[PDB]
Every structure is written in C-alpha cells, then in structure tokens.
TrEMBL record, chain A:
<comment type="subunit">
    <text>May be a homodimer, which associates with multiple calmodulin or myosin light chains. Interacts with RIPL2, the interaction is required for its role in dendrite formation. Interacts with MLPH. Interacts with SYTL4. Interacts with MYRIP. Interacts with RAB10; mediates the transport to the plasma membrane of SLC2A4/GLUT4 storage vesicles. Interacts with FMR1; this interaction occurs in association with polyribosome.</text>
</comment>
<comment type="similarity">
    <text>Belongs to the TRAFAC class myosin-kinesin ATPase superfamily. Myosin family.</text>
</comment>
<comment type="function">
    <text>Processive actin-based motor that can move in large steps approximating the 36-nm pseudo-repeat of the actin filament. Can hydrolyze ATP in the presence of actin, which is essential for its function as a motor protein. Involved in melanosome transport. Also mediates the transport of vesicles to the plasma membrane. May also be required for some polarization process involved in dendrite formation.</text>
</comment>
<protein>
    <recommendedName>
        <fullName>Unconventional myosin-Va</fullName>
    </recommendedName>
</protein>
Length: 48, 147, 147, 147
C-alpha cells in the first residue's frame, strides 16, 4: 500500500512538473514573438 | 507550525491550475489529484478521511484556507526514502538488487488498494521498465525521489 | 564575445524605437522587451535574473554598453520550433494537434507566472479561429518559426 | 544655432509673406506652415511641443532667436535621402522602388501619424501616384533634397 500510494503521488507530481515546464516554455516563446511584433510595429510607425 | 508563503503561493498556483471554476474551491476528486500532484504521499484511507471531513460541511468543495490547513497536516506526516527502500527490499526475494517486472505488476494489480492496469503500463513506459527484464528497485526509488 | 557591428546598429535602432528620448538608455522592462524582440527568448524569471545581474548600474537604466554586455554573455540559440511543437503536444492531452483555447488561457494565466489576458487574447487571435474552440498549435508554431 | 545671413533673410521674408498681422514674428500655426514651406523637418508631435512651448511663453508668435534655436534643432537631424529610401525599401516588399499605393498609404496613415482622408487623396493625385499600381518613391526623395 505504501509503495502504490507513493508511486501514484510521484506520477501525478511528474505530470504537474511536465505541465509547468511546457507552460513556461510556451509563455517564453509567446513573449518573444510579441516583442518581435512590437519592434516591427515601431519600425513601421517611425517610417510612416 | 507556519508554512512559508512561497510554498503557499505555489500551492495556490497548483490549485488554480486544475480549478476549473477559479473560485479557490474544487471537488475532492481533484483535491486528491492535486494532493498527489504536489509530490506528497497520502494514503487513500487518509484521502477518504479528508473527503469525509470536507463532506461534513456538505460543500464538497475545498476552500483555499482549509486547503492550506490540509497542506500543513500533510506536512506533519513525512515518510523517509529509506523506508521505501526497505519496502522494496522486502519484495526483492532474490536480493540481487533487481526485481521482476511481471511479479511487481501482479503485486500492484492484486494487493490492497488495486489500481488500473493502464496505470501499471504507465509505470512501465515512464520508468522505462522492461516487460520481462529485471529492474533495479534502487534506481526506481532514486528517480522516483528526484521529484 | 564582441558583437557584430550590424547587430550593434540594430540594437541602437531598437533603442531609438523603444526609447522616446533615443539616447540609447532603456528601462528593465524595456530591456526584456528588446531581448525578446531580437529573437532571443529568455524566461520572465530569467529576464529578471539578468536584470538583477546588471542591476542597471550604468545610469539607473539599461544603457548601450550594458546592453552589449548582456547580449554578449546571454547569446544563445536554445529556441527551436520542434521544442515548441513538443511542448504544445505536451499541452495536447488528446494529441490531435489542437489545444483548447479555454484550457490554454487557463494554463497561461494561472500556471506559474501569470500572463496578461491581453497576451492570451493576442495569441488566440493570432492563430486561426476554429469551430471546435481549439487552437491548432501546428500552424501557430509555423508562423512562430516564420517570425 | 546661428545661420547664414542668406537664410536669415529667407526666413524674414517668409515671415513677411505669412505676416498677416505684419508684426514680424510668425504665429505658431504659421510657424509650422513655414516649416513645411522651407523644407524643414518638424514632427507633428514636435509641432505640438513647439506650440505648447510658445503657449507657455504666451505671446503666440515666434521671435527670431527662438526661430534660429529651432533651426538648430531641425538641422541637428541632418536627414538625407538614403535613410528614408531604405525605410521605403523595407516598406517595399517588391524591392524595385515600385511600391503599391494602397498598402503603403494604409501603413502610412494607420501606423504612426494619422492622415486625414483628404490629405491622402490630394497627396496621391498631385504626386503622380497611381490609384492602385506600383509607384516609385526615389524621385520623390530626390526632389525632397533638391528643394
């Protein structure tokens, strides 16, 4: 019983950790793309 | 005891992750789901005890302050890694450091709190367990404890 | 690790764009925006770490020399379209290439660092709107790689 | 700061031409109009800055010393053909100098300073701009600097 409870707890913990890592990476890429778009927008506005 | 606010914030973030309502209250099923998702180890008996304590109020939803109290009560109980090592050594009849995958699967499936065989296959695939090859209990315990 | 003069000129151009004064000095938030505009993608926690490292010791704001030093020491190419696709598949519980817009918004806002709702709305509108309510992350990664 | 007496005479004569009151000092709106007349390079934001500075002064007219000072402010820009030709090039996805009037004017008005519909119409008509075809900009900047 101890083994199985610890195992299921660890499995859900690993699931949560993978979710967190993927979310952090996706947020990082999203912010990078948004900043790139903002820089291009600033370029366009200045030239206009 | 008083819990560090960083841990409290992490617990709140974990709660909000699966809180499909966003109100800081969620069903006891996802309560246990995030309890395990925190890395802690509650017995299903303790899970049922906590569920009935919540159901005494009749809400069926885990408010964040009571959730934090539950977190503290879980922090009260802390098993050691050596205990898990000894438990696995008990099932290591050979004592060669390796245990059989099929017999461990049978142990999981037909002892105590039986769980789904798909979860057993999840253990096999995630812990790169060979179907018949002997698997070291110690490496499994270590990569389990890494968290 | 000195930077190419073309990149130096591009950095000064970005300074002119972001800074109304256009003196080559930008704030820490502006520092992070320029970091992420160049194509280098550090995390918000990472960006705060480098901000504390530089500490704006030049003139209270990230100026051109500190900017050059930061870009020199933090030069990397860790961003990979396949990595983004794998992370989105990790999001995709179904694994069909489509991730629920509501679930994605919940994860972005609640999990870890909280994204602004405007950012999530921008990402939703950036990708093609779908009848199922799920954003196709494959094409999303496609134009993330494109620009 | 201090300009050639030829430019001094030119500016005084432009004053007198636009000196409807005949005071000898040009009005703020008349200041902007003669800046547009003399090939100067004021920004709409810069024009409003000048207007509010004069309002703080309160006279409503531009004396010659401040006129020469903002001549210095203008010529510190030392703008040339090539930079804005490059800006058109980055706007000219064709890259041949021939640029589509529709998208160019949409970016010109929507992004940055916003133009009234009339101003766009007369500027398209009088600057040999085709209604929808690809129009060259190089001659326009060449006769910018020629004036």
């Amino acid at each position: 019983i101890r083994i199985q409870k610890t195992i299921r707890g660890w499995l859900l913990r690993k699931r949560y950790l993978c979710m967190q890592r993927a979310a952090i990476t996706v947020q990082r890429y999203v912010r990078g793309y948004q900043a790139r778009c903002y820089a291009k927008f600033l370029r366009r506005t200045k030239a206009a | 005891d008083q819990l560090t606010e960083e841990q409290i914030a992490e617990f709140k973030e974990a709660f909000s992750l699966f809180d499909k309502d966003g109100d800081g209250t969620i069903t006891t099923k996802q309560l246990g789901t995030v309890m395990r998702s925190l890395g802690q180890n509650p017995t299903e008996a303790e899970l049922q005890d906590m569920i009935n304590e919540v159901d005494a109020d009749g809400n069926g939803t885990i408010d964040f302050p009571q959730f934090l109290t539950m977190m503290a009560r879980k922090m009260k109980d802390t098993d050691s890694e050596e205990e898990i090592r000894e438990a696995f050594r008990v099932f290591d009849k050979d004592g060669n450091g390796y245990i059989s995958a099929a017999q461990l699967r049978h142990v999981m499936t037909n002892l105590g709190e039986k769980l789904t065989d798909e979860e057993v296959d999840e253990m096999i695939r995630e812990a790169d367990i060979d179907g018949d090859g002997q698997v070291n209990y110690e490496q499994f315990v270590q990569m389990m404890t890494a968290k």
